[PDB]
mmCIF file of C-alpha atoms and ligand atoms in Angstrom:
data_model
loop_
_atom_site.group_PDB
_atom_site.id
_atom_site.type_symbol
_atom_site.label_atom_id
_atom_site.label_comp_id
_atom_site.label_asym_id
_atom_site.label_seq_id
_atom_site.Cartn_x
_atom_site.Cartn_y
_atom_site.Cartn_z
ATOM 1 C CA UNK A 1 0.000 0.000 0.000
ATOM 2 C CA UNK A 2 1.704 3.531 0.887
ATOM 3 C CA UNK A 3 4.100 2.522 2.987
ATOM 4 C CA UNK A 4 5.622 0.076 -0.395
ATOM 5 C CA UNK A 5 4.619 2.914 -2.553
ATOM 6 C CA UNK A 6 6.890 4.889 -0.454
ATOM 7 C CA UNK A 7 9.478 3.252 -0.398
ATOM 8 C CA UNK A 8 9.892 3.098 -3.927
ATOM 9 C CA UNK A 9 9.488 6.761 -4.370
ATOM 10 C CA UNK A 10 12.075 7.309 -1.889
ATOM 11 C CA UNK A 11 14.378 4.344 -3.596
ATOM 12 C CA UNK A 12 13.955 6.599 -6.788
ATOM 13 C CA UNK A 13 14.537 9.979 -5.265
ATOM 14 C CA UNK A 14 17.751 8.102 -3.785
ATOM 15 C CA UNK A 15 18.721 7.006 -7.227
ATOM 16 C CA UNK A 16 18.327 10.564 -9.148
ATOM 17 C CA UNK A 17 20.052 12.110 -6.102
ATOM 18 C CA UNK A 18 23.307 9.787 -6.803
ATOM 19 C CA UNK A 19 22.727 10.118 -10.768
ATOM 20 C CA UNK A 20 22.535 14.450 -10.280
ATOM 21 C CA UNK A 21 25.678 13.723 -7.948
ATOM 22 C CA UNK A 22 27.461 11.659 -10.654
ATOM 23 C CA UNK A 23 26.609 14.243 -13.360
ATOM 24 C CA UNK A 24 28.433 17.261 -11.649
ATOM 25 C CA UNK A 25 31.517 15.544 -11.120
ATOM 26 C CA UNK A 26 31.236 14.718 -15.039
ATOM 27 C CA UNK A 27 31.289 18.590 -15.129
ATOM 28 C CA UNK A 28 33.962 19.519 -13.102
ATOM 29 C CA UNK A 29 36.143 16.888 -14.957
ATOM 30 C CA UNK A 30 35.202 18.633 -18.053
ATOM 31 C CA UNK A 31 36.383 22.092 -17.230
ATOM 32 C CA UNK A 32 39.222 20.228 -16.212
ATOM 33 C CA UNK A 33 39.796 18.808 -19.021
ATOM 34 C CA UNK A 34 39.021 22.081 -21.404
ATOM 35 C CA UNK A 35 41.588 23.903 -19.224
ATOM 36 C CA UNK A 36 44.317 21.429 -19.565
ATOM 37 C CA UNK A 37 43.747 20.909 -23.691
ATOM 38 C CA UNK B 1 -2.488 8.579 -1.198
ATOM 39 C CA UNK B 2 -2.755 11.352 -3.634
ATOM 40 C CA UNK B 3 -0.739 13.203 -1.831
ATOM 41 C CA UNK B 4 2.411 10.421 -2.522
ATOM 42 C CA UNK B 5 1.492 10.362 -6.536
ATOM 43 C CA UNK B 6 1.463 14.139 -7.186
ATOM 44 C CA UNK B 7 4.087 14.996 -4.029
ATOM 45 C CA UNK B 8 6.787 13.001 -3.613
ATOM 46 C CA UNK B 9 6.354 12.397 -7.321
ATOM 47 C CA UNK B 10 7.221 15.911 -6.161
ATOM 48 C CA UNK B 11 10.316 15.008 -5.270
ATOM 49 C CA UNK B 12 10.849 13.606 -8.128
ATOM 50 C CA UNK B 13 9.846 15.508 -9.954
ATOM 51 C CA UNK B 14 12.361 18.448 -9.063
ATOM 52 C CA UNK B 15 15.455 16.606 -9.242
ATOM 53 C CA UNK B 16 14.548 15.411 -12.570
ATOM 54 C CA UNK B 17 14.767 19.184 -13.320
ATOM 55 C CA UNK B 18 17.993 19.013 -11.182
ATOM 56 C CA UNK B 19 19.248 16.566 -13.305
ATOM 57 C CA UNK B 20 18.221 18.192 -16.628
ATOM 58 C CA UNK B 21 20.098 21.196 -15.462
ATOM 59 C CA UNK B 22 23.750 19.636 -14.686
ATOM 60 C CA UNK B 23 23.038 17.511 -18.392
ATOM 61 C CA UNK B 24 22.351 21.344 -20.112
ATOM 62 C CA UNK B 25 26.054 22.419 -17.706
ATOM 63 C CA UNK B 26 27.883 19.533 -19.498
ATOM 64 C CA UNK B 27 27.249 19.995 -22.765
ATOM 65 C CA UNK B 28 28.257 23.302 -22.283
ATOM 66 C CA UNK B 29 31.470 22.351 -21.458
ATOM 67 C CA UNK B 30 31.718 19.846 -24.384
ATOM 68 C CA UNK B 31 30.751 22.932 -26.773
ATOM 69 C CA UNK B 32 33.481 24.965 -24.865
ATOM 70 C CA UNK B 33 35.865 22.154 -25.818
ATOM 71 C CA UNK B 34 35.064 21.509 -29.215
ATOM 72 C CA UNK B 35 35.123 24.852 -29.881
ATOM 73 C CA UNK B 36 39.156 25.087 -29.080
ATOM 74 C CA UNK B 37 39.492 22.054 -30.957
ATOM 75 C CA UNK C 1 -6.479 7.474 -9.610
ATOM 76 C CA UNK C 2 -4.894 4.214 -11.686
ATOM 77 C CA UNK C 3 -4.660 6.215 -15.418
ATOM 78 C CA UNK C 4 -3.762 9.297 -13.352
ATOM 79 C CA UNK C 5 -0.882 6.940 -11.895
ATOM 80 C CA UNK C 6 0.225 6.067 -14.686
ATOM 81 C CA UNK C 7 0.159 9.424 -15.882
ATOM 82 C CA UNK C 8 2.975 10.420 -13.313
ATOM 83 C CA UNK C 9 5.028 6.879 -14.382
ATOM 84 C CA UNK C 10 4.977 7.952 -17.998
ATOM 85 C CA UNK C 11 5.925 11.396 -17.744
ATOM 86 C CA UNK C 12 8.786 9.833 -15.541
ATOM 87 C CA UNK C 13 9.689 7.307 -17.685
ATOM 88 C CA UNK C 14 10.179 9.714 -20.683
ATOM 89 C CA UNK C 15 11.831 12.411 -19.111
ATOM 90 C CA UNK C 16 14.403 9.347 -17.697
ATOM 91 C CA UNK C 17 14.094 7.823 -21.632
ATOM 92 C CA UNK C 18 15.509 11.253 -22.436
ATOM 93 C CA UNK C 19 18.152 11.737 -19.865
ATOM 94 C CA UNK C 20 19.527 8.475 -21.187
ATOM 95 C CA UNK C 21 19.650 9.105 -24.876
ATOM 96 C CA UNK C 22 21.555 12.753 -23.732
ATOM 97 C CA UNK C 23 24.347 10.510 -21.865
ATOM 98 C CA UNK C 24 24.585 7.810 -24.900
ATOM 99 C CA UNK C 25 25.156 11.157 -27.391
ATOM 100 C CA UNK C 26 27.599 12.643 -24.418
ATOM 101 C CA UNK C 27 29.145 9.356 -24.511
ATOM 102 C CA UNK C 28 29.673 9.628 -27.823
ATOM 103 C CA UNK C 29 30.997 13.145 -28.102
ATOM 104 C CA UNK C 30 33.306 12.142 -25.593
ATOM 105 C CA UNK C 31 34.850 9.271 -27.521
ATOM 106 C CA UNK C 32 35.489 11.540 -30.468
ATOM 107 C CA UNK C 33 37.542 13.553 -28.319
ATOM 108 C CA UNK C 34 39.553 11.188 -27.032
ATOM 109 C CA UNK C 35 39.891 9.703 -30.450
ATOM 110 C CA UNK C 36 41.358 13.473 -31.722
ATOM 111 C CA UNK C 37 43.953 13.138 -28.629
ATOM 112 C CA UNK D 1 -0.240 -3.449 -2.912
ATOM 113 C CA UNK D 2 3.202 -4.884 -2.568
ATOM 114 C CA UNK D 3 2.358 -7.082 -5.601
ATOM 115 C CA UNK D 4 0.646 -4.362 -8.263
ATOM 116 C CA UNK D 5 3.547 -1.208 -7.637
ATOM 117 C CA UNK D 6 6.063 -3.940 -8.746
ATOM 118 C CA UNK D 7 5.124 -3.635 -12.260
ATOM 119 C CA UNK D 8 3.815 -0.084 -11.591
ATOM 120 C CA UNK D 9 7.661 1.252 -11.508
ATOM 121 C CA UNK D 10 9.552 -1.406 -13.348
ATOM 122 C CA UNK D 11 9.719 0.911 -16.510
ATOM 123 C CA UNK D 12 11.370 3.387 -13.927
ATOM 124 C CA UNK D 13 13.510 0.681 -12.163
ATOM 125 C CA UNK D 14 14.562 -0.538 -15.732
ATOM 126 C CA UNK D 15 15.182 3.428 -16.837
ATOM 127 C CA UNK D 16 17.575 4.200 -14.179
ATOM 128 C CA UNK D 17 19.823 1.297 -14.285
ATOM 129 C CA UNK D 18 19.851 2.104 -18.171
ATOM 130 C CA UNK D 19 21.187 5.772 -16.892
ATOM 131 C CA UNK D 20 23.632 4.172 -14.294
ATOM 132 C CA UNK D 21 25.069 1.993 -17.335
ATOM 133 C CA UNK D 22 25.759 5.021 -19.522
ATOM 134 C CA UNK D 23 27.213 6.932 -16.311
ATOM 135 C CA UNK D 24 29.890 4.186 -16.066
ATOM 136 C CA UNK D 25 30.305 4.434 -19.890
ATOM 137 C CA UNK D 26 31.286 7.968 -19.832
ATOM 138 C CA UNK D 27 33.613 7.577 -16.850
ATOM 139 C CA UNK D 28 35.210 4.863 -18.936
ATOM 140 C CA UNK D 29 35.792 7.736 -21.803
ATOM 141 C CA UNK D 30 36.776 10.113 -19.574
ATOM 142 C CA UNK D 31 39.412 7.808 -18.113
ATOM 143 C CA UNK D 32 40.605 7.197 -21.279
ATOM 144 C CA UNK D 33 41.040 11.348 -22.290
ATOM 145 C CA UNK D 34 42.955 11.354 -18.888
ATOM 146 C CA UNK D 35 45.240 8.530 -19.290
ATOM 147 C CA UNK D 36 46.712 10.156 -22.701
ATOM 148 C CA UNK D 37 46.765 13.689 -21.116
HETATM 149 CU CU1 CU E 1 5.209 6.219 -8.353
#
């Protein structure tokens, strides 16, 4: 009911958080990379 | 309930935008790269 | 309620759909540049 | 309940490990970049 509905909402939110986390270091290893070349 | 499928779904919702914005930063970058070949 | 659900799921699943197929063309980009160094 | 969600964000489930793969993919390219300088 909720509560599993809940849980996989927060599993997801979890997931995005890690994938927005992954995504900025992506970033900063690209302006690393355009300073350096 | 509804609450859970429209907020929290809220949650999601905003770091889907999160994540739309550090994908729109990166290819930045790359276009700041290619551009000094 | 259940279309309304699934409402929410879809408009997840294609704004995920599309964060995916910007990674695969970042991937991509990113493999010509290494290719040109 | 815990039996009809399952299916309910499978597409989502599915999505994100899709997402995580190309993550890992563009680490592996940036590697690379890094590696020759
Ligand atoms: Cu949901």
């Amino acid at each position: 009911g909720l509560a599993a509905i809940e849980q996989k909402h927060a599993a997801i939110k979890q997931e995005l958080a890690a994938i927005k986390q992954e995504l900025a270091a992506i970033k900063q290893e690209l302006a690393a990379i355009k300073w350096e070349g």
